[PDB]
Amino acid sequence: EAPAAVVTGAAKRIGRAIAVKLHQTGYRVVIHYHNSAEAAVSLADELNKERSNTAVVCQADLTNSNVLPASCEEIINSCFRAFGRCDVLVNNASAFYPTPLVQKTVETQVAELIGTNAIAPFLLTMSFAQRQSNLSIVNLCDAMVDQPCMAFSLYNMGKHALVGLTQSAALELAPYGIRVNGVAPGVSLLPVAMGEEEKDKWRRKVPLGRREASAEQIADAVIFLVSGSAQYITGSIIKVDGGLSLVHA
Amino acid sequence: APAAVVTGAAKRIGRAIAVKLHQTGYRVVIHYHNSAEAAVSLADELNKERSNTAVVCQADLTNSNVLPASCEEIINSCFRAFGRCDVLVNNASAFYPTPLVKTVETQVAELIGTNAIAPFLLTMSFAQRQSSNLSIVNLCDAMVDQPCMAFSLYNMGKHALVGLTQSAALELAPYGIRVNGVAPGVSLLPVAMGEEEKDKWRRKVPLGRREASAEQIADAVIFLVSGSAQYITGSIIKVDGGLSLVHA
Amino acid sequence: EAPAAVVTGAAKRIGRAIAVKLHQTGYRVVIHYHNSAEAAVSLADELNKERSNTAVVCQADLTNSNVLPASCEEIINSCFRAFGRCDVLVNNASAFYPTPLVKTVETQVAELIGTNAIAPFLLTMSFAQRQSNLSIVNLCDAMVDQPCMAFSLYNMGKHALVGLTQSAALELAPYGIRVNGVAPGVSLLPVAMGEEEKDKWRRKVPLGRREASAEQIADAVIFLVSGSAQYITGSIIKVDGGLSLVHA
Amino acid sequence: EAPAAVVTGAAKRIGRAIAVKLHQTGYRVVIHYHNSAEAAVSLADELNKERSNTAVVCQADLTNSNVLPASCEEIINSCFRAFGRCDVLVNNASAFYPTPLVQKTVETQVAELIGTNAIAPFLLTMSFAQRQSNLSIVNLCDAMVDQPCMAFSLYNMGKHALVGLTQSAALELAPYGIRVNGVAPGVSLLPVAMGEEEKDKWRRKVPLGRREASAEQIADAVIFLVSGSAQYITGSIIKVDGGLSLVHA
Ligand SMILES: NC(=O)c1ccc[n+]([C@@H]2O[C@H](COP(=O)([O-])OP(=O)(O)OC[C@H]3O[C@@H](n4cnc5c(N)ncnc54)[C@H](OP(=O)(O)O)[C@@H]3O)[C@@H](O)[C@H]2O)c1
Ligand SMILES: NC(=O)c1ccc[n+]([C@@H]2O[C@H](COP(=O)([O-])OP(=O)(O)OC[C@H]3O[C@@H](n4cnc5c(N)ncnc54)[C@H](OP(=O)(O)O)[C@@H]3O)[C@@H](O)[C@H]2O)c1
Ligand SMILES: NC(=O)c1ccc[n+]([C@@H]2O[C@H](COP(=O)([O-])OP(=O)(O)OC[C@H]3O[C@@H](n4cnc5c(N)ncnc54)[C@H](OP(=O)(O)O)[C@@H]3O)[C@@H](O)[C@H]2O)c1
Ligand SMILES: NC(=O)c1ccc[n+]([C@@H]2O[C@H](COP(=O)([O-])OP(=O)(O)OC[C@H]3O[C@@H](n4cnc5c(N)ncnc54)[C@H](OP(=O)(O)O)[C@@H]3O)[C@@H](O)[C@H]2O)c1
Ligand SMILES: CC1(C)N=C(N)N=C(N)N1c1ccc(Cl)c(Cl)c1
Ligand SMILES: CC1(C)N=C(N)N=C(N)N1c1ccc(Cl)c(Cl)c1
Ligand SMILES: CC1(C)N=C(N)N=C(N)N1c1ccc(Cl)c(Cl)c1
Ligand SMILES: CC1(C)N=C(N)N=C(N)N1c1ccc(Cl)c(Cl)c1
Secondary structure (H helix, E strand, C coil), X not given: CCXXXXXXXXXXXXXXXXXXXXXXXXXXXXXXXXXXXXXXXXXXHHHHHHCCCCEEEEECCCCCCCCHHHHHHHHHHHHHHHHCCCCXXXXXXXXXXXXXXXXXXXXXXXXXXXXXXXXXHHHHHHHHHHCCCCEEEEEECCCCCCCCCCCCHHHHHHHHHHHXXXXXXXXXXXXXXXXXXXXXXXXXXXXXXXXXHHHHHHHCCCXXXXXXXXXXXXXXXXXXXXXXXXXXXXXXXXXXXXXXXXXXX | CCEEEECCCCCHHHXXXXXXXXXXXXXXXXXXXXXXXXXXXXXXXXHHHCCCCEEEEECCCCCCCCHHXXXXXXXXXXXXXXXXXXXXXXXXXXXXXXXXXXXXXXXXXXXXHHHHHHHHHHHHHHHHCCCCCEEEEEECCCCCCCCCCCCHHHHHHHHHHHHHHHXXXXXXXXXXXXXXXXXXXXXXCCCCCCHHHHHHHHCCCCCCCCCCCHHHHHHHHHHHHCHHHCXXXXXXXXXXXXXXXXXX | CCCEEEECCCCCHHHHHHHHHHHHHCCEEEEEXXXXXXXXXXXXXXXXXXXXXXXXXXXXCCCCCCCHHHHHHHHHHHHHXXXXXXXXXXXXXXXXXXXXXXXXXXXXXXXXXXXXHHHHHHHHHXXXXXXXXXXXXXXXXXXXXXXXXXXXXXXXXXXXXXXXXHHHHHHHHHHCEEEEEEEECCCCCCCCCCHHHHHHHHCCCCCCCCCCCHXXXXXXXXXXXCHHHCCXXXXXXXXXCCHHHCCC | CCCEEEECCCCCHHHHHHHHHHHHHCCEEEEEECCCHHHHHHHHHHHHHHCCCCEEEEECCCCCCCCHHHHHHHHHHHHHHXXXXXXXXXXXXXXXXXXXXXXXXXXXXXXXXXXXHHHHHHHHHHHHHHHCCCEEEEEECCCCCCCCCCCCHHHHHHHHHHHHHHHHHHHHHHHHCEEEEEEEECCCCCCCCCCHHHHHHHHCCCCCCCCCCCHHHHHHHHHHHXXXXXXXXXXXXXXXXXXXXXXCC
C-alpha cells in the first residue's frame, strides 16, 4: 500500500539524501548503485531497520552500450519485483569529468557522460512508462548548464539533453498521468577530489549565504515535485542554486 | 507567528494564497483595491479561526506620484498589525489587451504599474523595513515567451517582473531575503471570458485538459516560502500543466 | 527612392554607428537626440555632405510622461515629413544608472522604464500605425539574466524590451513588419568609467578579452534590416564575444 | 588564398543551399554526404564548372559507433588535403524520426539520432580545432526545441545537446579565435513525402507570411555568421523561424 520509488546513484551524497527523505515520506525505495556496493547495502540496512522490507539495492552500470536498455528495464523491474509497483523514478546518477576539445577513448567518454546523464534517463523513462495515482519522474539537471565549466563539453551536452528529455517526456507522458520535472542544483556537495581552496572559491560565489547547498536542500525540492502539492506541475525545472546562476562573470 | 502581505488577496488566486498561508500559521494582510466587501469577508473567516491574525489594507497599485507612499503603507500595515513582515506575495495584476494598431498612458500606469512597478516599490519597502525565513514571491506568467496576441503591455509588465525577480534575488541575498516566482498558465479563467473560449484553453493543457485550481498555485507559493526552499532564490516555478511545452 | 530609418539616441556612440552604417547602406536617416544637440547636428551635416538631403535631426525626451505618446508620434512623423516614408525604426536610446533597493523614485521609473521600454512601445505603435522591407530593431542587453547588482529598474526595462520584441513580432507579422533585437554584452564602455574598471570588464570577454566596437554592434543591426533576414522576426542576436556564457 | 568550408549533409535541401551560398561567397567546399552520392557528385560538378577545383565530396555515415571519431577526423582531413586549410565547419546533417516512449532497435535509434545531431558535431568540432583568419563553426539547431513534437524525444535530446555543444565549444575555442554559433530554423523545407494538406497545416501557423523558410533563407543566416560582419558573435543561436516559436498552443 506504500508507494515505491527508484533512485539512481543513491548510495552516497545527493542520491542518498533523496532516498532517505523519500523513505521518511512513506516510500519504499530501490537504491541503485554502480560501484558503491558497501554504501548501498549499508543504507538499505539502515532503512529496513526503520521499517522492514522497505528498501532493496540494484546494481547497474548506466554507461551507454547495446545492453543499456536491458539494464534500465532491470532497474525498473527490480522495483516491481520487490514492491509490486513503481510510483516515482529519480534520475540522479551522473558521470562528470573534463573532455577538452583540444589536445579512456573518446567513444568511452561519450558512452559514460552521455549515457549516464541522458540516455540512461531516457531508457529508464521508457521502462517506467511501459510498466505502468501520483506517478512522477524527477531528473537531476544542472543550474549552470548555460554558463558551463570550460572543457566539460560532453557533460554539458548530456545535461542539456536531459532538459530536452524532461520537456519531451512531460508532454508525451501527461495523458498517462505521469509528471516529469527537474531539479537543477548549482553548487551542492563539492567533488571529494577537489582541494579546499577550490571548494572555498566556489562557495564564495554563491549569493545566498556564500555556501554550497546541503544534499538535504536538494532532496527537499525533489520531495515537493513528487508530492500532492505539485500535481499540476510538469515539464518544470526548479533551480536550487542560492542565486549562483544569476551572477555575471 | 510570522506575517505575510498578499496583494490582490480578496479574490481568486490571491485569496487562495492568503488562505493557505493562514492555514500554515501566518498572520496575513489582505490587500485590496476595489474589493472591500470580499476582503473583509475573508478577514472575518480567518479571524474566526484564530483571533486577530488577519487585517485588510486598501491601496490602488496604479503607478502615479503617490504609488511609493501607498506601497510603503501596505508594508507598514503589516509591521503595525503584527510587529514583523516575513513574506511578501506580489499577486495583484491588471490584464487586458493593448493593440499596437482609457488613454494609452493610463494603460501604461495600470499594466506596468500593477504588474511591475508596484512589486518593485513593495520590494524596496519590504527590504528597507528589515531564525527568520524572509522571502518574496512574485506571480509571473508561464506564457511570457509565447504571448497572447495584442497583449504587449501586459507581456512587457510580466517580463519586467521576471527581471525584478532576478535582480532582487541577487541584491537581497546578502540580507537573507529570497525572491522567487510562481508562473501559472491557465488557472482560474477570467470571469468575463465566455464558456466555449475557456474550454478551448482547457483542451490544450497536457496534464488533464483542465485549468489549475487557485489552490494548486497557492501550493507552489507555500513551498517557496517554506523551510524546504531555504536555498532557492531567483527561481520561477511554472505551474501550468505542461501548457508552455505545447507547440502551435 | 532610398528607404528611410529612425535611430533613437543616434548622436554618439552605438546609435551614431548604426545611423552611419545605415546611411552607408543607402538609407536616409532621422538622428534622434535628447541633450546631444551639437553632436547630432554635426553628424547630420557629415552625412548630408556625403549625400545631400539624406539626414535630419529630431529632438525628444523619451522619459515616460503623459506627453510621451505625442513625442513618439512626432519622431515617426519627422521621418515621413523629411523623406516620405519610414522603413526602419532602431530603438537605441537608453538611460542607465543604479536604483538600489535598500531624483525621486518615480522620476527614476519614468526615465529608466520610459527610455528602455515604454518609448520603444509607443514608437512601435506609431511606426506601425503610419504604414517593402519594414523592420524594427531594439537594442537589448545580453546580460539581462545575469544583471549588475543595484540596477533593478534598468534590468526591468530591458526585460520589458525583450517582451515588446516578442509581442510586437507576433502582432506585426501579418503587416510584414519584422521586429528583432540586438543584445550587446560589453561594447563601448561608459565615458565616466576609469581605465582600471574598463579593463576589469575587458578581461572577462572570452573572444579577444576586449569590448565590441560600435561598428560590430551596427553590423548586426544592418543584417537584421537587410534582405538576408527576411524570414527573421522575434529573434534577439547576442553580440557579446561569449561574455554571457562565463560563469561567476 | 580562398578559404575552405566543410558542410555536412550537403547533397540536398538546406545543406545544399548552404554549400552553394558559401561557394558563391568565395569558399572552396567539401560536400559531405551519406546516402545521396548522385546528388552530391552532381553538386560538386556544378560548382567545379563555375570554378575549377573548388568542390570535392566526402562520404561518411555519422551514426555513432567505434569508428565515428576516425570518420570525423577523415572529413576534416579531406578539406585540408583538397584545399590546404579549413576555415568553416557547418554541422547540418541530421536524422529525424519518432521514438515513442510508449508502445530499428532503440540503441540503433540512439546512435543515429544522438550521433548525427550531437556526437558527430562534437567530434567534427574536436577535429576542426585540433587541426588549426576568420575561423568559425555553425551548428544547425531547431527553433522549436522547447516546444517539441510529440514522440520525438531522442531527436529533441540530440538538438538540445547541440545547443550545449554550441555554448561549451564557443567558450573553450574563443581563445583560439574560433567562433561557434547556431542557426535554428522553424519550418523550412517540408519532408518530401508530406501531403500538401499537411504542409499547409504547418505553413498556416507561421506569423510571418504563413509560409516555410526557403533553404536559401536559412543559408543567408549561416553566411552572416561566417562573415566579417559577425566577428564578435560567438555562442549565439539565431532563430530563423518567421515568429513560429512565439505562437502559443
Ligand atoms: N553536487 C553538485 O554540486 C551538483 C551540481 C550540479 C548538478 N548536480 C547533479 O545532481 C546529481 C547528484 O550529484 P552528486 O554530486 O551527488 O553526484 P555524484 O556523487 O558525482 O554521482 C552520483 C552517483 O552516480 C553514479 N554513477 C556515476 N557513474 C555511473 C555509471 N557509469 N553507472 C551508474 N551510476 C554511475 C555513482 O554511483 P556509485 O558510487 O554507486 O558508482 C555516483 O555515486 C547528479 O546528476 C549531478 O550531475 C550536482
Ligand atoms: N488566473 C490565471 O490563470 C493566471 C495566469 C497567468 C498569470 N496569473 C497571474 O497570477 C496572479 C493572480 O491571478 P488572478 O486571475 O487571481 O488575478 P486577477 O483576478 O485578475 O486580479 C487579482 C487582483 O489584482 C487586483 N488589482 C487589479 N488592478 C489593480 C490596481 N490597479 N490596484 C490594485 N489592485 C489591483 C484586484 O483586486 P481588487 O479586486 O481588490 O480590486 C484583483 O482582484 C496575477 O499576477 C496574474 O497575472 C494568473
Ligand atoms: N555600450 C554597451 O556596452 C552596451 C551594453 C549593453 C546594452 N547596450 C545597449 O545598446 C544601446 C546603445 O548603448 P550606448 O552605450 O551607445 O548608449 P548610451 O551612450 O548610454 O545612450 C545612448 C543615448 O540614449 C539617449 N538618452 C538617454 N536618456 C534619454 C532620454 N531621457 N530621452 C531620450 N534619449 C535619451 C542619450 O542621448 P543624448 O546624448 O542625445 O541625450 C544617449 O546618447 C542602449 O540601448 C544600451 O542599453 C549597450
Ligand atoms: N527543414 C526544416 O524545416 C528544419 C526544421 C528545423 C531544424 N532543421 C535542421 O536543419 C538542418 C538541415 O535540415 P534539412 O531538412 O535540409 O535536413 P534533411 O534533409 O532531413 O537531412 C540532411 C541530410 O542529413 C544527412 N544525414 C541523415 N542521416 C545521416 C547519417 N546517419 N549520417 C550522415 N548524414 C546523415 C542526409 O544525407 P544523405 O541524403 O546524403 O543520406 C540528409 O540529406 C538539419 O540539422 C535539421 O535538423 C531543419
Ligand atoms: C560533484 C559532481 C562532480 N558530480 C556530478 N555528477 N555532476 C556535477 N555537476 N558535479 C559537480 C561538478 C563541479 C562542481 Cl564545482 C560541483 Cl559543486 C559539482
Ligand atoms: C486571470 C487573468 C485575466 N488575470 C490576470 N491578472 N492575469 C492573467 N494572465 N489572467 C489571465 C488571462 C488570460 C487567461 Cl486565458 C487566463 Cl487563464 C488568465
Ligand atoms: C554604456 C551603458 C552605460 N549605456 C547604456 N545605456 N546601457 C548600458 N548597458 N551601458 C553599459 C553599462 C555597464 C557596462 Cl559595464 C557597459 Cl560595458 C555598458
Ligand atoms: C526535414 C526534417 C525531417 N529533417 C531534419 N533533419 N530535422 C527536422 N527538423 N526536419 C523537420 C521535421 C518536421 C518538420 Cl514539420 C519540419 Cl519543417 C522539418
